């Protein structure tokens, strides 16, 4: 059963009436047949009354099947047979122009389901099955429920309007024409351009691809009342439809001739409008576009002003029509068809919130719509601004009704049981195993009802909780791509960045806060969500922080571009790093930087070296840093929308290698700390050009090796060990206990913190692998190199 | 013969009954025929009873043949005639709806073979061969059992659901729909995206290619019971299958029209789920050809959510559809399609493992499953993680199943003998040569039984070997490609690496152990199996081990990449000009290093003399050393997973080339040893950054001569000698007795180590060739140039 006619449903339900009244415990086709004759004035019922079959005549046979009867009528739903009649009736209604069904269609449906209960009832009460369907047909057919025309009611238009066309105005007489969504102020802006006749053509420019056609339908409607030029009220809008013209004509040349006929009758000037879509194509000018050079006829028609026409041209194409001249845009003039601006996005969301009705999820909240929009805008950041939006609302917009309804209670197990029976049960009936099948049926059907009750008992768990969707709902979904777990990405950013930076507690927090700030929406949203300079020791946090940003903000390790900006001046790309300068700053702008970042407009852009670089490097960084764009690659816009620009170079490093130890001399520690987290961003300022850098979120200051920043390089090296072992399926981790003992091997007074990986290798990599090869631990489980006695110990976990 | 059911086999066996009972020593088709009529109520028998033939009627004719008879019935098996009939019928039963073989099919098969003994029996007992096949046939056919058809017991759906198309729900009523293997969290994740209707569509992105389609079937099942929300409950699932949609009209226009028709019927209020495969193609966004631009209809329908739909989109294509805007993506949403990672792999293998017993010996054992995955990961290669796996398991699990039946020693030789006889015999009878054939016949039958008895006496060799399939089995198979022969390469690696390393016992063992650890299944699979830095001298050191490693682990000397870092002291590309440089580190990434290792991801990556090269280049290399990947060139990820990265360096070289000799005492051996065992690891740190060195397993130390590293250089050139003649025919050796005498000529204080090729040339090569041209050696003999009396001697050892 589904969305059917009443008439249908009514014959069908009457079957259930017969279920108990005649006692046929499961309702077969016979009851549907009775249903048909029992609705009296239904087209089926009426048909049966012609055939002589009254409710009586049918029922006399039917009661002789089960004769009142199993009045309990156990399993008091249908059997498949009657249900088959419904599938069939539907097809017998499809047959006669009903999406739904009808009383008629079910009687027709009976015939369809031959050698079923209805069918045998009718073959016992005489009545042949096709005589019955006949009877229905001869009280059916010639279906009409429309308006059935009244023709044109103005028609100066005739020589033209024969061809070609429907006319937009026609479809708007009783408004069988969709508006559609706009881009509403654009329709007004079209009517200025429509009120002319050597600028006659509004020329709608925008992606096609946003439902441009809505604005076009706009004109017709607006041309009626109570606002629009009287001259255009005194006009008619006729569409020059390319499709009807090409069909049955099969030539471009012939198509053009028909298009000419339409233009000639347009001599009614001061009364007629032609809409020529792809107005540029017809002009056939510019590029290699010469799709059809209708231009010969079209250009003078527009120019003479004997034609008032409507233009739909493409962004570049319009240029490539007006360039030819000498009265080309004596028609076109552009007006902007909006691709929904960010606020418009919000509105779209809200509009299609409401349509979740069998989908009960978003279905609220305002804030959730906002999250959808806003969160997408800042993070991923790889789609269009309203698409981004709408998607996020629905994204969250099922998830919760589903996580609710993940099983029948936990009574998913019921169904499994009901199976075990069915088998057992089944196999028993074949063996006989009489009462051994018996009790198995009973266990089956026991289960069966029990299943079904609890499969909809978490429809209570829906009606209780399941409309919501909030900011947070959206944020988890936005995070799925990439306002709870989008703002947790922001707020606990520092925690994430510290774990993959060699201390630099200062650096981490500076970046953390700067990105989280921007990513909140109030800083830098077209210019990178972090512009940065990262100064200080490299290896000791710097590169590693760039990595940690890629990971946290964008959701991937390798969502980080990395170009060296000092090479982009050809005064370092003739030298080391980059040997060849094939044009190199030109290579970057014209190619590399712009190309890379346009692919991922949500990635860490890392432009290395910017102190010893020259002012041209800084100009490039500055445009990104102010605007969020560079225009290169012949007018391409590279979207640095919510990239993180990180420009490196260091010159404060030394203090950021003097530590805030513990016990060294407290007055050197607590004056080394504050000093390194200051000195880097001030050592920066003296070498380069300032104009780029001031357009930066925070100028990131790195630190040393503290007591404890040191032990984070030990843990970077140890984390790097543990990371390279996974691909085969050797999952190894060093506990804190082992990371502590391993850290012991990195301190001297005479040695920095970098030798640690190799000794981590000796006691972990080398040691674990030389301990595994024996056959002590399985391949394909977790291997912990731990300390559990003050010495390394390999312990195991899943 | 094949696979047969009883009914068939019974008619056949009744032939054997007749073998002795009629004396048909080998039983022709007539006995099979009699067999047919003699099982009475079998379908063959029944047929024959129609024709009037009883068991009797056949048997009377049959008895008129041999006539009970040769009741010894020598070779109480079938005849070649009957063997054709049995083989024919079996297959003639496959032909007539029966996987195995039925009684009917044997009579039918008899008819097929209608010139045999049966056939003449029947032509003597009147009845025609086709009248008999008629009778059997009419007790076959009119199938439709176990099946019927149904639409949907609603079918509100009709105008759409008629047309056009299969519905997942329909086909799942009896469940004739395969799971398929998941991609399990994806099936859950589908219901997340699909009880959405402004993210209508889950959009499965991944390798196609693993079976995306498994996930799709997920939805169907869960809308029934019960993971689904109440949203996706009260819905029907329809697949938009592209072929019916395009129809016989064979156009894009027709496809769009049918898809539109579904959208109108979508009036079920989002309670219909439509599956649009390749939704991106339909959206028509991306590429220079969209592949139809259905997006226009789909976008308001999806946005309203009235069309609630299921997406299968391709990884990049999907991006190029949600980019289209503005509620296009308010459908699709990406989801990770499982292409098994190593742990997942193990589970997939297992899932179809037991079924490898269709071609027996596998399944078993667990350790082998694990091996399958793990062993591939370190030894061979870039291949997918479950594919790798499953193959090894089956590979070894068969290898041995033949070695059972290849151990009958080579009692295939028995089979060989029996031939010579047959021949002899046959040709002898043809001469007649009666008894002169006799003994040859007899000689055959001796053989025949002997042959066959010992090929299946090693069905004991089946019960012995033919299931076990362990790690060891798997490794042997992994080696077949390239833990028996994957760890034997390792375990004896040091021995193998030393024979082409010029001494440097330190170096050999260091590399040996690190590789042997990793490559035996226990470490470094993501990064190179060994990353290393090698300091040493040359020709008494480093390069020669790089070569020897390539040779031992991967096969052949020249499975070795080779990049010069001295060019990465770059500026060789501005004006000196070096191979295709975008600018030199850009050459390494953009082409040379990444392309070469993508070409061989199963090789020694040799980054020569990292040394004074730019530390930024080392950062690029560092990603290989850590990650085992670079992503460059065109977006390729280069798997250094199954490489052994070897970076050479030297700035300690001199000492590493300076002996280990008794140059002034034996404490000159043991402190020169120690001197070299110091000089590598400190010149390493002095050459370049520690960060580099830190993602390196071991620092490989190369020493020089006790007497002895020198005499190994002599043996490297002398081994190039021992290798080089087999290509043209001949086995050459410089005998060790002579390799010592040749080594005597390489000493001066002021010049040695290098002259050795030449002195081997003069004293060996040259000496042997000027004695071979005379004709003192035959071709393909082993030529040892030896010392036997303190002087060179050419001796031979074949």
From Swiss-Prot, chains A, B:
InterPro entries according to UniProt: AAA+_ATPase, ATPase_AAA_core, Clp_ATPase_C, Clp_N_dom_sf, Clp_R_dom, ClpA/B, ClpA/B_CS1, ClpA/B_CS2
Region (I): 161-408
Pfam families: AAA, AAA_2, AAA_lid_9, Clp_N, ClpB_D2-small
Domain named UVR: residues: 415-450
Region ranges (Repeat 1): 4-69
Keywords: ATP-binding, Chaperone, Competence, Nucleotide-binding, Repeat, Repressor, Transcription, Transcription regulation
Role summary: Competence gene repressor; required for cell growth at high temperature. Negative regulator of comK expression. May interact with MecA to negatively regulate comK.
Family: Belongs to the ClpA/ClpB family. ClpC subfamily.
Identification of the protein by name: Negative regulator of genetic competence ClpC/MecB
Species for this entry: Bacillus subtilis (strain 168)
Gene: clpC
């Amino acid at each position: 059963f589904g969305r059917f006619t009443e008439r249908a449903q009514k014959v069908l339900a009457l079957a259930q009436e017969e279920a108990l009244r005649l006692g046929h415990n499961n309702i077969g086709t016979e009851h549907i047949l009775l249903g048909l004759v029992r609705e009296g004035e239904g087209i089926a019922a009426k048909a049966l009354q012609a055939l002589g079959l009254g409710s009586e005549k049918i029922q006399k046979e039917v009661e002789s099947l089960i004769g009142r009867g199993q009045e309990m009528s156990q399993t008091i739903h249908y059997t498949p047979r009657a249900k088959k009649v419904i599938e069939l009736s539907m097809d017998e209604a499809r047959k006669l122009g009903h999406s739904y069904v009808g009383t008629e269609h079910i009687l027709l449906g009976l015939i369809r389901e031959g050698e079923g209960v209805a069918a045998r009832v009718l073959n016992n009460l005489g009545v042949s099955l096709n005589k019955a369907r006949q009877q229905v047909l001869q009280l059916l057919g010639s279906n009409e429920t429309g308006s059935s025309a009244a023709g044109t009611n103005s028609n100066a238009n005739t020589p033209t309007l024969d061809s070609l066309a429907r006319d937009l105005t026609a479809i708007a007489k009783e408004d069988s024409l969709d508006p559609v969504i706009g881009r509403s102020k654009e329709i007004q802006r079209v009517i200025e351009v429509l009120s002319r006749r050597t600028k006659n053509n509004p020329v709608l420019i925008g992606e096609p691809g946003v439902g441009k056609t809505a604005i076009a339908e706009g004109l017709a409607q607006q041309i009626i009342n109570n606002e629009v030029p009287e001259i255009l009220r005194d006009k008619r809008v006729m569409t020059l439809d390319m499709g009807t013209v090409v069909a049955g004509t099969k030539y471009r040349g012939e198509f053009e001739d028909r298009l000419k006929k339409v233009m000639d009758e347009i001599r009614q000037a001061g009364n007629i409008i032609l809409f020529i879509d792809a107005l540029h194509t017809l002009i056939g000018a510019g590029g290699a576009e010469g799709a059809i050079d209708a231009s010969n006829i079209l250009k003078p028609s527009l120019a003479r002003g004997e034609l008032q026409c409507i233009g739909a041209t493409t962004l570049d194409e319009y240029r490539k029509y007006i360039e030819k001249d000498a009265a080309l845009e004596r028609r076109f003039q552009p007006i902007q068809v909006d691709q929904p601006s960010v606020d418009e996005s919000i509105q779209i969301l809200q509009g299609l919130r409401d349509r979740y009705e069998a989908h009960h999820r978003v279905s609220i909240t305002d804030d959730a719509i906002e999250a959808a929009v806003k969160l997408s805008d800042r993070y991923i950041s790889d789609r269009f601004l309203p698409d981004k939006a709408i998607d996020l609302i629905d994204e969250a917009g099922s998830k919760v009704r589903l996580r609710s309804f993940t099983t029948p209670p936990n009574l998913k197990e019921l169904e499994q049981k009901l199976d075990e029976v069915r088998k057992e049960k089944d196999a028993a009936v074949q063996s006989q195993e009489f009462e051994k099948a018996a009790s198995l049926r009973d266990t089956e059907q026991r289960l069966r009802e029990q299943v079904e009750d609890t499969k909809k008992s978490w429809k209570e768990k829906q009606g209780q909780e399941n409309s919501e969707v909030t900011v947070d709902d959206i944020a988890m979904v936005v995070s799925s791509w990439t306002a709870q777990t989008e703002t947790d990405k922001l707020l606990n950013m520092e925690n994430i960045l510290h774990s993959r930076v060699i201390g630099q507690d200062e650096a981490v927090v500076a970046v953390a806060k700067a990105v989280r700030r921007a990513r909140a929406g109030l800083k830098d949203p077209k210019r990178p969500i972090g512009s940065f300079i990262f100064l200080g020791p490299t290896g000791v946090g710097k590169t590693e922080l760039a990595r940690a940003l890629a990971e946290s903000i964008f959701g991937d390790e390798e969502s980080m571009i990395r170009i060296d900006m000092s090479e982009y001046m050809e005064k370092h790309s003739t030298s080391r790093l980059v040997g060849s300068p094939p044009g190199y700053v030109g290579y970057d702008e014209g190619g590399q930087l712009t190309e890379k970042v346009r692919r991922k407009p949500y990635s860490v852009v890392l432009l290395d070296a910017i102190e010893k670089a020259h002012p041209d490097v800084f100009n490039i960084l500055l445009q990104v840093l102010e605007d969020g764009r560079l225009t290169d690659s012949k007018g391409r816009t590279v979207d640095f929308r919510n990239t993180i620009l990180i420009m490196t170079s260091n010159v404060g490093a030394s203090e950021l290698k003097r530590n805030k130890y513990v016990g060294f001399n407290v007055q050197d520690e607590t004056q080394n700390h504050k000093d390194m987290k200051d000195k880097v961003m001030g050592e920066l300022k003296r070498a380069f050009r300032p104009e780029f850098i001031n357009r930066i979120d925070e100028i990131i200051v790195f630190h040393s090796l503290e007591k404890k920043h040191l032990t984070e390089i030990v843990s970077l090296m140890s984390d790097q060990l543990t990371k390279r072992l996974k691909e085969q399926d050797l999952s190894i981790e060093l506990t804190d206990a082992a990371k502590a003992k391993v850290a012991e091997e990195g301190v001297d007074l005479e040695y920095g913190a970098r030798p640690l990986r190799r000794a981590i290798q000796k006691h972990v990599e080398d040691r674990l692998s030389e301990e595994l090869l024996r056959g002590n631990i399985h391949k394909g489980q977790h291997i912990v190199l731990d300390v559990e006695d003050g010495e390394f110990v390999v312990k195991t976990t899943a």
